[PDB]
């Protein structure tokens, strides 16, 4: 509709519909970043819709790559993506983006990150999907029953000379 | 249908690692700064680079390989093209020469490209975490920046750069490959053993998957040492022009200048200051101008440069050292006296500077860095000219700056915040590292069953990105952050410091001394 | 096989100091080739040249290993068909050699199985070792602040009359005598009497059993020798050590005294070769010469070479290009200061300016 | 004062020598690179 | 060698009117085969020591 | 041989950035521009500038681009004159290079006239006497070394002392409201710094793409070969000269860095067969710089206010290049690294600065008297500082300690936060009026503020800001006392 201009005043392509379709056809969410890279190279900066699609692919994708990658985390990738969007692109995440993050936290069983995201949605957005808040609490209380509330080695009593400093 | 080369003359003279050519009458002729092949055998060729074109028709050649095979009278063929080397993701995890030949271990990019235009760049706004608290706070580095590392021999110039490469391993594994930081480590005039030791060190931490090594050892001719930085940056410009970020380390430019001096003098170039060629500034100037932060319109990729430079007796008045300092956007000065004084990394904050400023810091680090900067400034002056708050916290900040391995962002920022808000005022300076170790690798609240926080715990490594988004001084994270620090301080003082201050036995004293020294090398 | 240029005949065209130009009608032999002067010239000893540059397709510039006295133009020269080769193997143990590999101990013939050229390529990356361990010397300063590494490279930087030679002898007595492997002593531009004293010392200690098995080889090109010899004796000594390391997988000690004279010798010839001097007056190829030499002094997967090199600092100026460039080629650096010695402190090590690579808790306790 | 004066008078002597040496090295390099051409004179007329 | 020289001569348009001549040179670097050079165009069909 | 336009020559020698050209009909005049018409498979055109005549047919030249892919005997065609650059109001808001070609990717520029970059300097009779103070909004400059309109200003400094920052502050304070035009010449400096300047100027509306701009940019930077860095200054100066003469306007001329012009010529000097002079600069160092500097002057037609940044290599002001530039300036601002290391910005050493208009006839008597008193007090304070280290502060007399206490306040009161260094400092900048600076310092000298805390003068503007900071300091101190009292 309205032409966008870049930092130096040159115009940027705004027709970012085909790229979203490409993102919605990926198998592993690392391939989504490649699409974002191609968009930037083609002077087609992503919009809010593009980032949400990327988050959706991350949540719905099996893994980062065809082969496993050590210490890979879906939550970390999405949060970094949001950091890029808000800080280095000046775009405010909407409710949809945070919901995807909350779904990932619930799905992965990380019930402590869910609490933080729950407050974020209750602070920036308007509340949280009460379906997901309840799911996270269920995961937390399962840990209490099973005893996996904190890593066990932390609970072990220690002393001044009883700590192994690697 | 023949593989017809372009013969341009014969080899006239050979002087070490350089040669001269005489053109055969009535031949096409060779172009300046092009690659030529000296036919050492009907099937074997030695690479050379054109450097001079004299009135007599004679040609100055810089030999690159198979020098021992070169003899006077051999034929020379002209490719007619500049130097191009392999580039791509298929080179990562490998050791290569400036010519692209792989070195066994136990797309073509032009090496003479021009730097990005003025309107092809963007302001530096993305941080590059070295992993060291001193640098990340007081000497910010941003992607697309040239940060010199100047110091004396045996001061940590190589270690800090290698640690910076390693610190990206953990980050790259979690975030998308879009924001991953690739590494090009260039060794110039170094020992072959050191390269192997570096290769093993990178492999141990798994950094080879995101890193490649370009080596021109001492035994190799000066030509390779002269082209290594240009070849290395070329491999890093592949990612820059494709919306990705790279980090190029040059170890070190000091030995590159010597090689260029050797080549110029042998080829009858007039010497200049300290016998260096007149155009020695222009050599590094065009090398470091190629490291930039491309604009949104060209992809947003970047190349970050960490050239290393050696001084003699902490003399930064030398020729090449001054030239490089007048080129880079900042300098990290490693001081010998601090290094021997126990401060490691021996970063001299007074002599170090980053011209990018806070723009190359994350929103979370800006507030901590800004306030930390004022305290240290007062601390430097107070002692130079009384337990005032600036002097109480300044010493503890200095103690927290001693490190041996790069630190995760979450661990470093939290510790700095604690020391900033006075949580370490009651902690003795000697025990600061021990306090930090327990905070990071332990949780006193859980140990003593007094932890009421819901999510904020130091063992939840995923909190790093939430901190990096919202800041520590935000209502989401601030309330629980203070509670955890308050509990950790109270528990630490009560259960640990009291016993530590009550030790008199020689056996216990020695045991404590070992513990605290180990804590320095652990966190 | 046999070289295609052996027996090639050339004539002397120009003589300046130790630098001689030779014109070959059929074509100049390859660089580094060895040539023998055939004309009698009334000399008392033979004359040998080593090619270092090619002036044209027929003319080649060379350095003489002996004095060029009584050398006329048009003198006849014959190629030897290869580089300067020296004996290798156990036959050399217990013997004294010169730059050319000729025994100078006035004893029986060496009878070596074979010879190998002095100039050789260095070990590659894949042939490098990864073993770090402490060599106990018995000296307090070294073992504490700058411990030495087995199979590593050690340098003793010092002025004149500071204690470089004394420390080397102490290390020899405390290590070499009680050493399972072999030892090679390379004297380069040092006092001839010191070599004689060392030879007597090694005979008394029975490290050289004239009638039995010996563990030490001596290679000596001393101050009196012309610059050509002093620039190649180190190569020959290193070649013997390389053979022991690789062809036998045996640990070797390499005591070089003094390595600075090697660079000084190349500087003297470079001035005559017609090259523009670098800073101070040294040859522009100072770094490359050291790199080629030092990179050969390393421990591979086949064997180990522990090298101890004495470095002379001219005018007590540690910033001189020669010693300055050598720091990067050493695992351990031992800097000696004249003022410390004048205070009665021996050894005069300045610990603040010393360094070691194995000063790592992962290696030492 | 007697030890820092000697190092100041020793430094000025070295500084003068090195700067002059540099200049002469460049002078000799530009002289060496120069080559005399064929002499176009009446050689026979002699 | 003559056949190769003629083929190279045909390819070169500048030497269309020029008359072909062959000059033999002895190279000790090649043990077998031959090479042909014409107006800078060099064709190698030779082998040396293995 | 009058009109050499289209004359043909052949490349005879190529060594680095220096190329020798042979003309059968005679070498064109020196400073002539030549184009390499031969198709060498280059990505950029190659142009050369004649600098010397080796004989009646051979000429030595410096290239403006890289000499890669250049062969011998390559054809070369003269352009019929020296290097020409566009001039006029149509260049406003645009970025140019040494050759006068736009590099902003903003479309063709409508040029009605072009002028050669090499021109003869004004003669003695073309000199105008303009003694008027220039208010830069900086306490140190306006007081100790006031600037003069239509004059020449130098910022001598090492690396990292704040030369570029001061230039940015001067632009923000003098150029935004300038009646006339401005020309910025980047010479052998970082390319990113030029980019930041372009963005800031667009934001400040100095360069109005849609409207009317009032500044020109000419950039030859480090990446460029020495040939370009030795002529970019001439190109920008030519644009300013046109605005001065033809348009009769008062123009600003910022140059950063002028040293690179000397450095580039030294790099090529070796290959031109010239014996190096002392340190290692070219023998023509003084003459080449003088010709350029004399062109940068205010004549009877118009005025050029020139601000030039000089790099003092290794903080050695005895170096030939910095020293040679001191006699070609009307106001010198010498920056010192020691001052900066102490937290004082701008790191000006007032004892080493000087100004031509520091005379009572030009400036007000109060201004002259205040400045001299400040300088004398600073001089005396430095002598006392030697005593204070040997004897100690206790031994100083009553008079001496009053000098010490007053002088320390002067040292800290000279510091000022700039509006462009907010990221570096983290505080808003201040613009101090000339009258406020004089009154504030006058009161300080006579002890009107002896009871004010010393730190109240640190990184503030006028006297009013000093009082406010002191009040804030008092409040926080009272809070700390209250907290201690409760304990
Ligand atoms: N942060 C550190 N803490 C403790 N030791 C360190 C640290 N950084 C480096 N070192 C040690 O200091 C020594 C010198 O380090 P390094 O190899 O980085 O020096 P350098 O600057 O490369 O010197 P050079 O290359 O000239 O030898 C090594 O033993 C290294 O392990
Ligand atoms: N460890 C030591 N203990 C006592 N005296 C020593 C010691 N080392 C050296 N000296 C004294 O210093 C003198 C010179 O020592 P040394 O022969 O080692 O010199 P150097 O370093 O080899 O110098 P150069 O070979 O250039 O003469 C000795 O003769 C002796 O008087
Ligand atoms: N007014 C100032 N306030 C604070 N720091 C400053 C100021 N001016 C300069 N600096 C320091 O100097 C750096 C910029 O140096 P710069 O202006 O480029 O100097 P130069 O061009 O002389 O090297 C800043 O990053 C900061 O560290
Ligand atoms: Mg290093
Ligand atoms: Mg000795
Ligand atoms: Mg600057």
Short mmCIF file of N, CA, C and O in Angstrom, two decimals, chain B residues 145-211:
data_model
loop_
_atom_site.label_atom_id
_atom_site.label_comp_id
_atom_site.label_asym_id
_atom_site.label_seq_id
_atom_site.Cartn_x
_atom_site.Cartn_y
_atom_site.Cartn_z
N UNK B 145 32.91 -4.56 13.26
CA UNK B 145 33.89 -3.69 13.89
C UNK B 145 35.29 -4.27 13.75
O UNK B 145 35.47 -5.49 13.67
N UNK B 146 36.27 -3.38 13.72
CA UNK B 146 37.68 -3.75 13.73
C UNK B 146 38.23 -3.38 15.10
O UNK B 146 38.34 -2.20 15.44
N UNK B 147 38.58 -4.39 15.89
CA UNK B 147 39.09 -4.20 17.25
C UNK B 147 40.49 -4.77 17.32
O UNK B 147 40.67 -5.99 17.35
N UNK B 148 41.49 -3.89 17.37
CA UNK B 148 42.87 -4.31 17.49
C UNK B 148 43.11 -4.95 18.85
O UNK B 148 42.48 -4.60 19.85
N UNK B 149 44.05 -5.89 18.88
CA UNK B 149 44.50 -6.52 20.11
C UNK B 149 46.01 -6.32 20.15
O UNK B 149 46.75 -7.06 19.49
N UNK B 150 46.46 -5.33 20.90
CA UNK B 150 47.86 -4.94 20.90
C UNK B 150 48.45 -5.28 22.26
O UNK B 150 47.82 -5.06 23.30
N UNK B 151 49.66 -5.82 22.24
CA UNK B 151 50.31 -6.16 23.49
C UNK B 151 51.72 -6.63 23.26
O UNK B 151 52.22 -6.64 22.13
N UNK B 152 52.37 -7.01 24.35
CA UNK B 152 53.70 -7.58 24.27
C UNK B 152 53.61 -9.10 24.14
O UNK B 152 52.55 -9.71 24.30
N UNK B 153 54.75 -9.71 23.83
CA UNK B 153 54.80 -11.15 23.71
C UNK B 153 54.44 -11.80 25.04
O UNK B 153 54.81 -11.32 26.11
N UNK B 154 53.70 -12.91 24.96
CA UNK B 154 53.27 -13.65 26.14
C UNK B 154 52.44 -12.76 27.07
O UNK B 154 52.81 -12.48 28.21
N UNK B 155 51.30 -12.31 26.54
CA UNK B 155 50.36 -11.52 27.32
C UNK B 155 48.91 -11.95 27.14
O UNK B 155 48.04 -11.37 27.79
N UNK B 156 48.63 -12.93 26.30
CA UNK B 156 47.28 -13.38 26.07
C UNK B 156 46.63 -12.87 24.81
O UNK B 156 45.40 -12.94 24.70
N UNK B 157 47.41 -12.36 23.85
CA UNK B 157 46.82 -11.87 22.61
C UNK B 157 46.12 -12.98 21.85
O UNK B 157 45.01 -12.80 21.34
N UNK B 158 46.77 -14.14 21.75
CA UNK B 158 46.17 -15.26 21.03
C UNK B 158 45.06 -15.92 21.84
O UNK B 158 44.01 -16.28 21.28
N UNK B 159 45.26 -16.07 23.14
CA UNK B 159 44.29 -16.80 23.96
C UNK B 159 42.93 -16.12 23.94
O UNK B 159 41.89 -16.78 23.82
N UNK B 160 42.91 -14.79 24.05
CA UNK B 160 41.65 -14.06 24.11
C UNK B 160 40.88 -14.22 22.81
O UNK B 160 39.65 -14.42 22.82
N UNK B 161 41.57 -14.13 21.68
CA UNK B 161 40.89 -14.30 20.39
C UNK B 161 40.35 -15.72 20.24
O UNK B 161 39.23 -15.91 19.77
N UNK B 162 41.15 -16.72 20.62
CA UNK B 162 40.69 -18.10 20.54
C UNK B 162 39.50 -18.31 21.46
O UNK B 162 38.53 -19.00 21.10
N UNK B 163 39.54 -17.73 22.66
CA UNK B 163 38.41 -17.83 23.57
C UNK B 163 37.17 -17.18 22.97
O UNK B 163 36.06 -17.68 23.13
N UNK B 164 37.35 -16.05 22.27
CA UNK B 164 36.22 -15.40 21.63
C UNK B 164 35.58 -16.31 20.59
O UNK B 164 34.35 -16.39 20.49
N UNK B 165 36.40 -17.00 19.80
CA UNK B 165 35.88 -17.95 18.83
C UNK B 165 35.13 -19.07 19.55
O UNK B 165 34.04 -19.48 19.12
N UNK B 166 35.69 -19.56 20.64
CA UNK B 166 35.08 -20.67 21.37
C UNK B 166 33.77 -20.24 22.00
O UNK B 166 32.81 -21.02 22.06
N UNK B 167 33.70 -19.01 22.50
CA UNK B 167 32.51 -18.55 23.19
C UNK B 167 31.28 -18.56 22.30
O UNK B 167 30.15 -18.57 22.80
N UNK B 168 31.47 -18.55 20.98
CA UNK B 168 30.34 -18.59 20.06
C UNK B 168 29.80 -20.00 19.84
O UNK B 168 28.73 -20.15 19.25
N UNK B 169 30.52 -21.03 20.31
CA UNK B 169 30.08 -22.40 20.07
C UNK B 169 28.74 -22.66 20.74
O UNK B 169 27.79 -23.13 20.11
N UNK B 170 28.64 -22.34 22.03
CA UNK B 170 27.42 -22.60 22.76
C UNK B 170 26.26 -21.79 22.20
O UNK B 170 25.13 -22.30 22.08
N UNK B 171 26.51 -20.54 21.85
CA UNK B 171 25.45 -19.69 21.31
C UNK B 171 24.96 -20.23 19.98
O UNK B 171 23.75 -20.32 19.73
N UNK B 172 25.89 -20.61 19.10
CA UNK B 172 25.52 -21.05 17.76
C UNK B 172 24.68 -22.32 17.80
O UNK B 172 23.87 -22.55 16.90
N UNK B 173 24.87 -23.15 18.82
CA UNK B 173 24.13 -24.40 18.90
C UNK B 173 22.66 -24.17 19.20
O UNK B 173 21.81 -24.99 18.81
N UNK B 174 22.32 -23.07 19.87
CA UNK B 174 20.96 -22.83 20.32
C UNK B 174 20.17 -21.98 19.33
O UNK B 174 19.09 -22.39 18.88
N UNK B 175 20.69 -20.81 18.97
CA UNK B 175 19.99 -19.89 18.09
C UNK B 175 20.00 -20.43 16.66
O UNK B 175 20.72 -21.38 16.35
N UNK B 176 19.21 -19.81 15.80
CA UNK B 176 19.17 -20.21 14.40
C UNK B 176 20.51 -19.95 13.73
O UNK B 176 21.30 -19.10 14.16
N UNK B 177 20.77 -20.70 12.66
CA UNK B 177 22.01 -20.52 11.91
C UNK B 177 22.09 -19.14 11.27
O UNK B 177 23.18 -18.73 10.85
N UNK B 178 20.97 -18.43 11.17
CA UNK B 178 20.99 -17.09 10.59
C UNK B 178 21.92 -16.17 11.38
O UNK B 178 22.72 -15.44 10.80
N UNK B 179 21.82 -16.21 12.71
CA UNK B 179 22.58 -15.33 13.58
C UNK B 179 23.86 -15.98 14.09
O UNK B 179 24.55 -15.38 14.92
N UNK B 180 24.18 -17.18 13.63
CA UNK B 180 25.41 -17.83 14.05
C UNK B 180 26.61 -17.05 13.55
O UNK B 180 26.56 -16.37 12.52
N UNK B 181 27.70 -17.14 14.31
CA UNK B 181 28.92 -16.40 14.02
C UNK B 181 29.97 -17.40 13.55
O UNK B 181 30.44 -18.23 14.33
N UNK B 182 30.34 -17.31 12.28
CA UNK B 182 31.41 -18.14 11.74
C UNK B 182 32.76 -17.51 12.06
O UNK B 182 32.86 -16.31 12.31
N UNK B 183 33.80 -18.33 12.07
CA UNK B 183 35.13 -17.87 12.44
C UNK B 183 36.16 -18.26 11.40
O UNK B 183 36.17 -19.39 10.90
N UNK B 184 37.04 -17.31 11.09
CA UNK B 184 38.18 -17.53 10.21
C UNK B 184 39.41 -17.14 11.01
O UNK B 184 39.68 -15.95 11.22
N UNK B 185 40.16 -18.13 11.47
CA UNK B 185 41.39 -17.88 12.22
C UNK B 185 42.57 -17.98 11.26
O UNK B 185 42.79 -19.02 10.65
N UNK B 186 43.33 -16.89 11.15
CA UNK B 186 44.44 -16.80 10.21
C UNK B 186 45.73 -16.73 11.02
O UNK B 186 45.93 -15.80 11.80
N UNK B 187 46.59 -17.71 10.82
CA UNK B 187 47.90 -17.76 11.46
C UNK B 187 48.96 -17.36 10.45
O UNK B 187 49.04 -17.95 9.36
N UNK B 188 49.75 -16.36 10.80
CA UNK B 188 50.74 -15.76 9.91
C UNK B 188 52.10 -15.85 10.59
O UNK B 188 52.29 -15.31 11.69
N UNK B 189 53.04 -16.52 9.94
CA UNK B 189 54.39 -16.59 10.46
C UNK B 189 54.53 -17.28 11.79
O UNK B 189 55.56 -17.14 12.45
N UNK B 190 53.51 -18.01 12.21
CA UNK B 190 53.57 -18.73 13.47
C UNK B 190 54.19 -20.11 13.28
O UNK B 190 54.36 -20.59 12.16
N UNK B 191 54.55 -20.73 14.39
CA UNK B 191 55.06 -22.09 14.35
C UNK B 191 53.96 -23.07 13.95
O UNK B 191 52.79 -22.88 14.27
N UNK B 192 54.36 -24.11 13.23
CA UNK B 192 53.40 -25.12 12.81
C UNK B 192 52.80 -25.84 14.01
O UNK B 192 51.62 -26.21 13.99
N UNK B 193 53.58 -26.05 15.06
CA UNK B 193 53.07 -26.73 16.25
C UNK B 193 51.94 -25.93 16.89
O UNK B 193 50.93 -26.50 17.31
N UNK B 194 52.09 -24.61 16.96
CA UNK B 194 51.06 -23.79 17.58
C UNK B 194 49.74 -23.90 16.82
O UNK B 194 48.67 -23.94 17.43
N UNK B 195 49.81 -23.96 15.49
CA UNK B 195 48.59 -24.14 14.70
C UNK B 195 47.93 -25.46 15.06
O UNK B 195 46.71 -25.53 15.25
N UNK B 196 48.72 -26.52 15.17
CA UNK B 196 48.16 -27.82 15.52
C UNK B 196 47.55 -27.78 16.92
O UNK B 196 46.47 -28.34 17.14
N UNK B 197 48.22 -27.13 17.86
CA UNK B 197 47.67 -27.02 19.21
C UNK B 197 46.37 -26.23 19.21
O UNK B 197 45.44 -26.56 19.95
N UNK B 198 46.30 -25.19 18.39
CA UNK B 198 45.06 -24.43 18.27
C UNK B 198 43.98 -25.28 17.62
O UNK B 198 42.81 -25.26 18.04
N UNK B 199 44.34 -26.05 16.60
CA UNK B 199 43.36 -26.90 15.93
C UNK B 199 42.77 -27.91 16.90
O UNK B 199 41.55 -28.12 16.93
N UNK B 200 43.61 -28.56 17.70
CA UNK B 200 43.12 -29.49 18.70
C UNK B 200 42.24 -28.79 19.73
O UNK B 200 41.20 -29.31 20.13
N UNK B 201 42.66 -27.60 20.16
CA UNK B 201 41.89 -26.87 21.17
C UNK B 201 40.50 -26.53 20.66
O UNK B 201 39.50 -26.72 21.36
N UNK B 202 40.41 -26.04 19.42
CA UNK B 202 39.11 -25.75 18.84
C UNK B 202 38.28 -27.02 18.69
O UNK B 202 37.07 -27.02 18.94
N UNK B 203 38.92 -28.12 18.29
CA UNK B 203 38.19 -29.37 18.09
C UNK B 203 37.61 -29.88 19.40
O UNK B 203 36.51 -30.45 19.43
N UNK B 204 38.34 -29.70 20.51
CA UNK B 204 37.88 -30.22 21.79
C UNK B 204 36.55 -29.59 22.19
O UNK B 204 35.65 -30.28 22.68
N UNK B 205 36.40 -28.28 21.98
CA UNK B 205 35.17 -27.58 22.30
C UNK B 205 34.15 -27.64 21.17
O UNK B 205 33.06 -27.08 21.31
N UNK B 206 34.48 -28.29 20.06
CA UNK B 206 33.55 -28.39 18.95
C UNK B 206 33.41 -27.13 18.13
O UNK B 206 32.36 -26.91 17.53
N UNK B 207 34.44 -26.29 18.10
CA UNK B 207 34.38 -25.04 17.35
C UNK B 207 34.73 -25.20 15.88
O UNK B 207 34.51 -24.27 15.10
N UNK B 208 35.28 -26.35 15.48
CA UNK B 208 35.64 -26.54 14.08
C UNK B 208 34.42 -26.53 13.17
O UNK B 208 34.52 -26.15 12.00
N UNK B 209 33.26 -26.95 13.69
CA UNK B 209 32.06 -26.97 12.88
C UNK B 209 31.66 -25.58 12.41
O UNK B 209 30.96 -25.45 11.40
N UNK B 210 32.10 -24.53 13.11
CA UNK B 210 31.77 -23.15 12.76
C UNK B 210 33.03 -22.32 12.50
O UNK B 210 32.96 -21.09 12.50
N UNK B 211 34.17 -22.97 12.28
CA UNK B 211 35.44 -22.28 12.18
C UNK B 211 36.30 -22.95 11.12
O UNK B 211 36.24 -24.16 10.91
#
